[PDB]
Design a protein around this ligand. Structure first.
Ligand SMILES: CCCCCCCCCCCCCCCCCC(=O)OC[C@H](COP(=O)([O-])OCC(O)COP(=O)([O-])OC[C@@H](COC(=O)CCCCCCCCCCCCCCCCC)OC(=O)CCCCCCCCCCCCCCCCC)OC(=O)CCCCCCCCCCCCCCCCC
Ligand SMILES: CCCCCCCCCCCCCCCCCC(=O)OC[C@H](COP(=O)([O-])OCC(O)COP(=O)([O-])OC[C@@H](COC(=O)CCCCCCCCCCCCCCCCC)OC(=O)CCCCCCCCCCCCCCCCC)OC(=O)CCCCCCCCCCCCCCCCC
Ligand SMILES: CCCCCCCCCCCCCCCCC[C@@H](O)O[C@H](CO[C@H](O)CCCCCCCCCCCCCCC)COP(=O)(O)OCC[N+](C)(C)C
Ligand SMILES: CCCCCCCCCCCCCCCCC[C@@H](O)O[C@H](CO[C@H](O)CCCCCCCCCCCCCCC)COP(=O)(O)OCC[N+](C)(C)C
Ligand SMILES: CCCCCCCCCCCCCCCCC[C@@H](O)O[C@H](CO[C@H](O)CCCCCCCCCCCCCCC)COP(=O)(O)OCC[N+](C)(C)C
Ligand SMILES: Nc1ncnc2c1ncn2[C@@H]1O[C@H](COP(=O)(O)OP(=O)(O)O)[C@@H](O)[C@H]1O
Ligand SMILES: N[C@@H](Cc1ccc(O)cc1)C(=O)O
Lengths: 347, 104, 320, 53, 56, 122, 44, 49, 98, 458
């Protein structure tokens, strides 16, 4: 692919997301989604091979079905109230269809199956984009229509997402599928607090995006897509594996690391309403994500796996391309808890 | 090769007394070893142990044991002089307490 | 400025620097044949850059200072003990073969990077496309196992497919008895133990796999022993080749851009040489790996990045 | 979520088409122009929670 | 010759300096909790002809 | 739920309303600013470590820029956070003042008139 | 005399396409080293 | 000592170093000035001095 | 609502059910997607004409435009799938699992 | 109390800027100086606590714990430098960094004024311990041990967190002084019962309570020597400190919510003491000893009397010192013979007499010989339990008989009998090991000389 064409496609993806974020008209929001998908399909196919083509096809089918349901919900809402402005969604059937369409776009359970497959079928850069930038538009719409949400449906989907993310991640040796299941669980956490406080949703999204960016950038720096290939990195660059171990611990939600901050905050918010059983269940379930993060840390940093002879040659060369934002991303992923009250600036 | 992998053999353990018959067991470098021994002994026994015990032994009476004993002595003297009971079953004056009006 | 998407966007294009004499050349041949002299003569006459055959310490000559390192920290294999004890139960044979393939891949990447950066041609002795013959001669003699051949084929499959095969393949044919006579006249006590079956296996692999499969990508110039000393005739035979059949004419600016991004970044070149396949011949335990890596990091110019080693005379570090 | 770029810049990117009581071509009126106008004027400025009642 | 000695043993002032800085910060923290100084019913006292505050 | 998005008078993308100028600015020795500078210094050290450069001495200009950028952003972040908390307090106090029926101050009782159950420990 | 570290037998536990293999997934293969499946000879 | 150019030479990149130092100094001066004006405006609005 | 509205809604539901239930051909599912787009066009046009929302009359045309884009996207992908397998069966898209 | 916190944070860069062959000396010297500074916290009042600021305070319960932590750091450093000689400089500095971070987290945990800050630090102690265990442990089981150490803790502490935030929504504060002054009784409802369980189970699993103790033998056996020292001496006392803090809001529910835990503690104390009688690994015996002593501490905290609280404080301090000393004593033999089997090396009194004296004194303090503070705590708890119910003297009595038995058993197995003939590599004791034993044991008897410093706020 031409670099000019790649830049144009990335800019079109971002423009579709921005159009979703700045629009007041439902038609313009739908157009933003369409433009984002149209530009996103070729980016997933940048390195051409059958797996990338399969991932792109599955992604297109899922997102096109979601957009059809989105448009039908908009039209039903218009039928029962001649309104185009994104507001309290005057019809409940239309609101149910809207919620299901947005959940399918986000990959929330039980519309979760496509996320591990698409993530595994594409490159690490495409996976970074898909798991970070592609969450902004549906979450922005959900934040805008939160007051009309049905808490039962969204809470059911969020709890299912957390459970399924943990259970599915428990079974993986491929790093991209691990990241996808982690994303599913974190989306569940984000949507669990949405009917109560959208500021907490934004805070969780920001912290998750920072940690995911650090994770994907560390995985690109050490060209590993499997557990066994990541188990070699200690014999080439131990600093990368140590930073990865601390980042995994933060993603597990352990204090005093930054990944503990959202869950903590969310739990507190849920106890400001009554909502006692659900946060307890959510934390006990997030223990599963912590377990498979810890297994990855065992494989890559806390023990030393056997290496190969040809690795000696790799000792003689340095990394050519350097990521300028990786150190700041790591620091923000780990040492940010003491600045928790700054979340007031989010609302 | 009838082998599984290329590995170093497990090495024998080093005796610190071989190269240093008076070795103190702190370091293989004799001078660093001797000074580690010296600093451990000086700052562990001479400074923290003895001086800390002396400091704790002479800590001033912030627990107010002697003050309480003297106050009790004055109270007992006064109460025995005036024939009052040494202690009262009530520690709060009933005139400052308002019981509920009705018990039925 | 480092070559990248920005350089390609404005200005830099590879297709313009090709001036009809790019012509990646390789000069293959059996053991002790005079292919190196012929390659040097070809490079001198045509004005191309000559690459001597990649040995155990080829990577050493391109990083740090060009001096070779200790065999323990680089290679971890011996050609002399391969000749002495080819059936050693310590895995020396396939370890040497795998390290040599990695070295050849690095040299091919260097040559391609030079050609794509300057437009000047290159002349190589052997390549990644020709290394396999030795592996075959190793397997037919029982020197390595079948699992080693499977691992070698996997690595070659995932590595050699990303580059362009050479424009013209030059072969020097020498009979096995003549090779034995040359080896005896040489005097190296390690090469006198080469049995004729090994050389015959190398020749069979060449003439039955390499030349037939290379002739489909481009025409192959074969020369006997006597008609290789006359290098000017070989050069003027090269100068009249109609090279319009292989993948090289099917290259445009974007494919060249991708290839140029690949040939630099030697880590990406060597990515798949260390795949987690645990053959006992090439697998190294954690304790030995840690000890050897600690030993390597203590070399005088290796602890930090090239410009940041003040123990080899790097100044102004605290502003770099 | 919603960055009110239109409000900040005063651009009117899509607000012209949100409601049926807003400046149609040739002054063609919607079938329910008066009802929507009355509802909008009732609900203006008091928030969704109060307007719903 | 004190250059080598200093560059070898300058790490021995970090902990005493930290102790002094911690003492200073504790005094600063005490400075921010004087809202009831000489105001409790148990310890309220008339000032001496010279002293300004009852405690620092 | 969104508490403060529809608060009347809010300019969409301001980040710092003019009213916030009536609040005392954070001191330049604020411990939160010191921690932000510490985060910048840690970022510089990690940058040195990843690039295989001497961690503490490699780039002093780069480390200085890291610390300066973190402090510069942290100052305005702290200003906005303090403004938001001041706004919350202002609205809470105004609402309590305007709805006295929902916030009554009931008569005070001393502990000599309050009957508390005693639970012996035995 | 020295700390235990993982060997080849330990490392092979993570080399499969999945953890906790079953009868159904014992035939799942790990993806190719580069994400390129061999081309089928689907001649038209 | 190095066999290759090692584009970062013994002398540092003076343009980049100057740009970095200038950016840091300008940011510090801007921050000091902004804090001074903020203190002045707060004092004026609340009428302390 | 009139009977026509219910009929159009039923058509949309039928097309959605047809899309969600794959048989073998990807082309049939793409046809179901196009049918859903057509049903949405008809429903929106009927609503906009009934209420005399003059400026909304351009909205259905916009829908059609993006429908075409979506239709083109799908076809492009189908081409690649066919070039890999010689067929457009959804059974062949099984290299990636959960 | 930043005058203690800041010097540890300064230990961090002092270690990372030290010369390669001076890390142990500098760390030990400045750790001992920090312990000497922390000695001043023992000046406590009779009425309230030392309220340093809005964030930190010192009581008569937390000051001896802080002193024990700061004193344990140099001993851990002394015990670790033998088996880390072959390590690289960077990894040694990382190990020392883990120890320093653990000390900092413990120091801030014992003095936090709010319960959520206490929770955050009390969970933050997990990371350095897990890293130490799983990176510097010797055998392959360490990995499993780490997992057992982690989830057992977190499965207890995640409910507590929820309860904590719930409480802050009900009373408006988690400050311990406000919580104590504004205390209100807990009614008898299912919601209150589950709040009680959420507030109690994390500390119960930290002690650990019998039945929830399986993580402890694994973690304390597979850990390196410093890890075992800090796990037995300080990290087990987090549960007791947290329980004594949290019980102020649980009355009068405790009056009947303590019965299952009291039964578990008494019977499991008998059970773990019995388990110590048939143990082939010397470290596992010491771990099960810790379990029995902590069961005693749990009983003392649950019956909620001034005498039981004083006994619990004294027992925690005494057990910390004694168990750390016993782990070091076992580690000397392990480093000599590279095996933890108790019957492998026998008759060591003939080869190492002074080490045999250290063994005798440690085992004497384990069985609570009077007038050691071990015995003082045990006797106070037994007297309080007798007041609670006269029948407890049976179970407690049985425990006193079993403990001594296994204690002396350990001694008789290792020091007496005849030496093993084929073991010829038993070198004379180093000055470092003797100094370590002395620096463990002398503070115990010195504390016996003045027992009111470890008797707590009651
Ligand atoms: C809470 C209170 C405050 C605490 C704050 C939080 C903690 C501290 C801040 C954290 C970030 C700071 C450092 C970041 C960069 C470090 C990266 C690194 O590699 O370090 C190497 C570097 C040494 O490299 P070198 O000198 O170039 O030569 C050696 C070679 O490079 C040889 O290098 P190598 O690569 O060849 O060696 C390989 C090695 C290399 O691997 C590493 O070095 C690991 C480093 C990972 C960085 C940490 C991750 C990101 C930060 C998150 C931390 C979370 C903390 C919360 C608690 C949870 C714990 C995880 O890997 C291994 O050996 C594998 C070991 C497996 C163990 C796994 C455990 C790792 C996680 C532990 C993290 C603990 C915190 C940091 C520890 C200190 C690190 C220096 O270390 C340093 O020297 C820098 C540290 C000291 C500089 C600061 C001193 C300031 C100036 C002195 C005066 C003080 C002023 C006071 C004012 C008063 C005036 C008098
Ligand atoms: C009661 C007499 C009072 C005498 C007045 C002065 C006493 C000064 C003692 C100062 C503290 C002792 C130092 C502890 C470390 C041990 C020294 C060492 O490493 O040996 C090297 C040193 C060099 O000799 P070596 O030729 O190389 O032979 C070494 C071989 O390894 C083999 O060496 P070995 O075979 O000769 O054995 C070494 C020795 C050393 O091993 C030890 O057992 C000594 C550690 C004491 C036991 C710790 C657990 C018991 C809990 C009770 C705590 C009491 C502490 C009170 C406050 C202490 C203040 C620091 O063990 C024994 O001889 C048998 C131990 C059986 C003791 C039974 C008594 C139970 C309590 C009875 C009364 C206690 C309270 C008194 C007031 C009561 C009301 C009036 O050994 C000696 O010089 C002999 C040690 C002297 C024995 C002291 C036993 C009585 C003192 C008990 C506490 C002191 C109370 C003082 C207050 C005034 C009354
Ligand atoms: C190797 C050879 C061994 C045998 C040979 C020995 C030779 C003789 C030496 C033995 C001496 C016998 C001891 C007899 C006791 C005499 C001293 C005693 O009287 O002093 C006590 C004082 O002892 C101290 O108070 C106890 C020491 C404090 C313990 C702190 C240890 C230092 C910290 C180390 C690290 C901490 C780790 C543990 C954490 C909790 C009494 O205190 P007190 O009745 O009031 O005094 C009233 C008058 N005052 C108050 C004015 C002073
Ligand atoms: C894991 C660490 C998280 C860090 C995340 C990235 C940090 C760096 C990014 C820098 C942000 C640049 C923004 C500054 C330019 C001004 C933009 C301004 O106009 O935007 C305002 C918005 O202000 C921003 O939201 C503030 C951004 C600051 C975020 C930091 C909070 C993180 C939580 C605390 C963790 C500690 C952070 C430490 C920092 C290093 C307008 O408000 P408004 O248009 O009406 O909001 C629209 C959405 N609503 C209405 C639905 C709410
Ligand atoms: C391995 C070790 C793990 C740690 C050990 C933790 C110990 C936890 C045990 C909990 C102690 C008691 C919990 C609740 C107190 C009373 C329980 C109940 O049995 O008592 C009767 C309760 O009556 C009946 O029993 C109803 C409860 C029956 C259902 C509970 C299920 C218990 C079955 C055993 C399951 C095992 C649980 C532990 C899993 C590991 C009292 O009658 P009632 O006065 O009306 O109830 C008092 C509460 N009121 C006042 C609000 C009404
Ligand atoms: N891939 C290989 N495997 C084993 N040995 C090799 C390999 N490549 C080169 N050699 C060894 O290099 C030696 C000389 O190389 P060669 O190029 O054939 O002779 P010359 O130096 O005269 O050109 C020979 O002993 C040959 O065996
Ligand atoms: N809690 C007890 C502690 C104490 C014990 C013995 C003492 O001598 C003094 C104090 C009070 O009273």
């Amino acid at each position: 692919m031409n670099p000019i064409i790649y830049t144009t496609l990335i800019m079109t993806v971002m423009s579709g997301t921005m159009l979703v974020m700045i629009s007041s008209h439902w038609l313009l929001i739908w157009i933003g989604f369409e433009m984002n998908l149209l530009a996103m399909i070729p980016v997933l196919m940048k390195n051409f091979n059958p797996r990338a083509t399969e991932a792109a096809t599955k992604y297109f089918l899922t997102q096109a079905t979601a957009s059809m349901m989105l448009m039908m919900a908009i039209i039903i809402n218009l039928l029962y109230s001649g309104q185009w402005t994104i507001t309290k969604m005057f019809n409940p059937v239309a609101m149910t269809m809207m919620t299901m369409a947005l959940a399918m776009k986000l990959g929330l359970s039980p519309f979760h199956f496509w996320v591990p497959e698409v993530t595994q079928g594409i490159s690490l850069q495409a996976g970074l984009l898909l798991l970070t930038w592609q969450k902004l538009a549906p979450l922005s719409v959900l934040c805008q229509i939160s007051q009309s949400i049905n808490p039962n449906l969204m809470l059911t989907m969020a709890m299912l997402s957390i459970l399924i993310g943990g259970w599915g991640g428990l079974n993986q040796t491929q790093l991209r599928k691990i990241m996808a299941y982690s994303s599913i669980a974190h989306m569940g956490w984000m949507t669990a607090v949405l009917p109560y406080n959208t500021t907490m949703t934004i805070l969780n999204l920001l912290i998750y995006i920072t940690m995911t960016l650090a994770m994907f950038m560390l995985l690109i720096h050490s060209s590993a897509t499997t557990t066994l290939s990541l188990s070699h990195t200690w014999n080439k660059m131990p600093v990368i594996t140590s930073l990865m171990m601390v980042t995994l611990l933060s993603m597990g939600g352990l204090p005093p690391l930054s990944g503990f901050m959202p869950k903590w905050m969310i739990i507190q918010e849920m106890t400001k309403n009554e909502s006692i059983i659900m946060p307890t269940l959510m934390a006990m379930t997030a223990l599963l994500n912590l377990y498979f993060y810890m297994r990855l840390a065992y494989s890559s940093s806390l023990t030393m796996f056997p290496s190969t002879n040809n690795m000696k040659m790799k000792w003689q060369f340095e990394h050519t391309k350097q990521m300028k934002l990786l150190p700041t991303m790591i620091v923000l992923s780990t040492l940010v808890l003491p600045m928790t009250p700054a979340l007031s600036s989010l609302n | 090769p009838t082998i599984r992998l290329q590995e170093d053999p497990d090495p024998e353990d080093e005796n610190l007394y071989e190269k240093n018959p008076d070795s103190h067991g702190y370091d293989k470098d004799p001078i660093v070893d001797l000074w580690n021994m010296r600093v451990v002994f000086f700052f562990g026994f001479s400074i923290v142990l003895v001086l800390g015990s002396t400091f704790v032994a002479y800590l001033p009476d912030y627990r107010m044991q002697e003050w309480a004993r003297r106050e009790a002595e004055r109270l007992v003297k006064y109460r025995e002089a005036n024939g009052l009971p040494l202690m009262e079953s009530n520690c709060f004056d009933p005139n400052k307490i308002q019981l509920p009006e009705d018990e039925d | 400025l480092q070559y990248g998407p920005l350089a390609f966007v404005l200005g830099e294009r590879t297709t313009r620097k090709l001036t009809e004499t790019s012509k990646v050349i390789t000069v293959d041949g059996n053991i002790c044949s005079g292919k190196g002299r012929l390659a040097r003569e070809i490079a001198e006459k045509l004005g191309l850059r000559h690459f001597p055959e990649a040995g155990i310490h080829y990577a050493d000559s391109t990083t740090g200072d060009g001096k070779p390192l200790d065999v323990q920290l680089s290679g971890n294999c011996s050609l002399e003990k391969f000749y002495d004890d080819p059936k050693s139960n310590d895995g020396n044979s396939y370890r040497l073969q795998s390290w040599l393939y990695a070295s050849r891949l690095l040299q091919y990447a260097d040559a391609l990077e030079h050609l794509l950066s300057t437009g000047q041609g290159v002349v190589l002795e052997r390549s990644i496309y020709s290394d396999f013959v030795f592996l075959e001669a190793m397997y037919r003699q029982g020197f390595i196992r079948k699992q080693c051949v499977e691992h070698y084929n996997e690595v070659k499959k995932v590595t050699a497919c990303e580059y362009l095969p050479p424009h013209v393949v030059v072969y020097v044919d020498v009979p096995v008895p003549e090779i034995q006579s040359r080896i005896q006249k040489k005097g190296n006590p390690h090469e006198m133990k080469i049995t004729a079956a090994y050389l015959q296996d190398i020749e069979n692999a060449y003439k039955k796999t390499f030349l037939p499969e290379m002739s489909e990508k481009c025409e192959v110039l074969q020369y006997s022993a006597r008609e290789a000393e006359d290098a000017e005739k070989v050069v003027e035979d090269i100068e009249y080749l109609k090279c319009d059949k292989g993948p090289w004419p099917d290259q445009d600016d974007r494919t060249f851009h991708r290839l140029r991004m690949l040939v630099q970044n030697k880590l990406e070149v060597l990515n798949y040489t260390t795949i987690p396949v645990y053959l006992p011949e090439i697998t190294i335990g954690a304790h030995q790996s840690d000890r050897v890596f600690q030993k390597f990091t203590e070399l005088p110019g290796r602890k930090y990045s090239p410009g940041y080693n003040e123990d080899v005379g790097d100044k102004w570090i605290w502003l770099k | 979520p919603f960055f009110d770029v239109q409000k900040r810049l005063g651009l009117d990117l899509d607000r012209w088409m949100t409601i049926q009581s807003a400046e149609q071509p040739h002054k063609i009126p919607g079938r329910c122009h008066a009802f929507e106008k009355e509802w909008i004027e009732c609900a203006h400025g008091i928030g969704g929670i109060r307007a719903e009642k | 010759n004190v250059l080598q000695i200093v560059r070898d043993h300058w790490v021995h002032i970090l902990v005493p300096v930290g102790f002094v800085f911690g003492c200073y910060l504790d005094r600063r923290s005490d400075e921010k909790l004087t809202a009831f100084r000489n105001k409790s019913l148990l310890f309220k006292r008339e000032l001496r002809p010279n002293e300004e505050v009852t405690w620092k | 739920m969104t508490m403060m998005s529809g608060r009347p008078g809010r300019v969409p993308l301001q980040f710092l309303p003019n009213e916030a100028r009536s609040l005392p600015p954070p001191k330049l020795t604020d411990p939160r600013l010191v921690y932000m500078g510490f985060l910048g210094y840690c970022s510089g050290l990690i940058d040195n470590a990843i690039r295989r450069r001497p961690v503490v001495s490699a780039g002093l200009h780069r480390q200085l820029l890291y610390v300066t950028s973190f402090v510069f952003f942290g100052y305005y972040l702290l200003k906005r956070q303090d403004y938001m908390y001041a706004l919350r307090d202002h609205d809470m106090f105004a609402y309590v003042k305007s709805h006295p029926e929902d916030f009554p101050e009931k008569d005070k009782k001393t502990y000599g008139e309050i009957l508390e159950e005693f639970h012996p420990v035995r | 005399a020295r700390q235990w570290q993982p060997d080849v037998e330990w490392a092979e536990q993570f080399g499969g396409a999945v953890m906790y293999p079953t009868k159904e997934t014992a035939h799942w293969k790990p993806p190719p080293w580069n994400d390129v499946d061999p081309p089928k000879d689907t001649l038209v | 000592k190095f066999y290759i150019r090692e584009p970062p030479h013994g002398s540092p990149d003076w343009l980049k170093v100057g740009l970095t130092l200038g950016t840091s100094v300008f940011l510090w001066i801007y921050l000091i000035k902004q804090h001074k004006e903020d203190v002045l405006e707060y004092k004026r609005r609340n009428g302390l001095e | 609502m009139p009977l026509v509205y219910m009929n159009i809604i039923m058509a949309f539901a039928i097309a959605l059910a047809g899309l969600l239930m794959y048989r073998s051909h990807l082309m049939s599912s793409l046809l179901c997607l196009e049918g859903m787009m057509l049903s949405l066009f008809i429903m929106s046009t009927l609503i906009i004409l009934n209420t005399h929302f003059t400026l909304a009359n351009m909205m259905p045309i916009i829908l059609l435009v993006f429908a075409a884009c979506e239709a083109a996207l799908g076809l492009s992908l189908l081409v690649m799938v066919s070039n890999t397998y010689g067929t457009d069966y959804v059974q062949n898209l099984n290299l990636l699992q959960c | 109390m930043l005058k203690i916190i800041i010097p540890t944070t300064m230990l961090l860069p002092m270690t990372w800027m030290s010369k390669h062959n001076m890390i142990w000396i500098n760390a030990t010297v400045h750790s001992l100086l920090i312990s000497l500074i922390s000695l001043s916290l023992l000046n406590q009042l009779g009425e309230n606590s030392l309220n340093f600021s809005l964030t930190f305070f010192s009581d008569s319960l937390s000051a001896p714990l802080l002193v024990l932590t700061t004193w344990l750091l140099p001993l851990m450093l002394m015990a670790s430098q033998s088996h880390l000689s072959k390590e690289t400089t960077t990894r040694k500095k990382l190990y020392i960094t883990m120890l320093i971070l653990l000390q900092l987290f413990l120091i801030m945990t014992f003095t936090a004024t709010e319960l959520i800050l206490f929770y955050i630090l009390f969970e933050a102690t997990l990371v350095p311990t897990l890293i130490i265990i799983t990176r510097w442990g010797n055998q392959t089981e360490r990995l499993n041990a780490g997992l057992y150490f982690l989830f057992y803790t977190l499965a207890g502490s995640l409910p507590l967190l929820v309860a904590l935030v719930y409480i802050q929504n009900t009373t408006g504060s988690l400050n311990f002084l406000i919580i104590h002054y504004w205390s209100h009784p807990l009614s008898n409802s299912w919601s209150n019962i589950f709040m009680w369980l959420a507030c109690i189970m994390a500390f119960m699993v930290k002690m650990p309570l019998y039945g929830l103790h399986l993580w402890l033998p694994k973690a304390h056996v597979e850990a390196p020597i410093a890890g075992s020292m800090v796990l037995a001496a300080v990290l087990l006392k987090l549960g007791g400190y947290g329980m004594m803090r949290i019980t102020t809001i649980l009355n009068p529910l405790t009056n009947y919510m303590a019965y299952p835990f009291l039964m578990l503690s008494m019977w499991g104390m008998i059970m773990t003491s019995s388990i110590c009688l048939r143990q082939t690994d010397l470290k596992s015996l010491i771990a099960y000893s810790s379990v029995s002593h902590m069961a005693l501490v749990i009983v003392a905290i649950m019956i909620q009397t001034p005498w039981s609280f004083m006994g619990a404080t004294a027992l925690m301090i005494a057990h910390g010192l004694t168990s750390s000393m016993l782990f070091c004593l076992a580690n000397t033999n392990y480093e000599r013979v590279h095996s933890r089997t108790m019957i492998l090396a026998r008759g060591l009194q003939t080869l190492l007499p002074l080490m045999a004296t250290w063994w005798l004194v440690a085992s004497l303090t384990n069985l609570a010989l009077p007038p050691s503070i071990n015995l003082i705590g045990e006797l106070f708890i037994i007297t309080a339990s007798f007041s609670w119910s006269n029948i407890t003297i049976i179970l407690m009595g049985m425990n006193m008989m079993i403990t001594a038995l296994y204690s002396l058993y350990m001694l008789i197995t290792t020091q007496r009998g005849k030496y093993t003939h084929h073991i010829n590599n038993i070198k004379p004791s180093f000055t470092r090991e003797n100094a370590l034993m002395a620096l463990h044991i002398l503070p115990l008897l010195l504390l016996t000389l003045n027992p009111k410093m470890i008797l707590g706020p009651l």
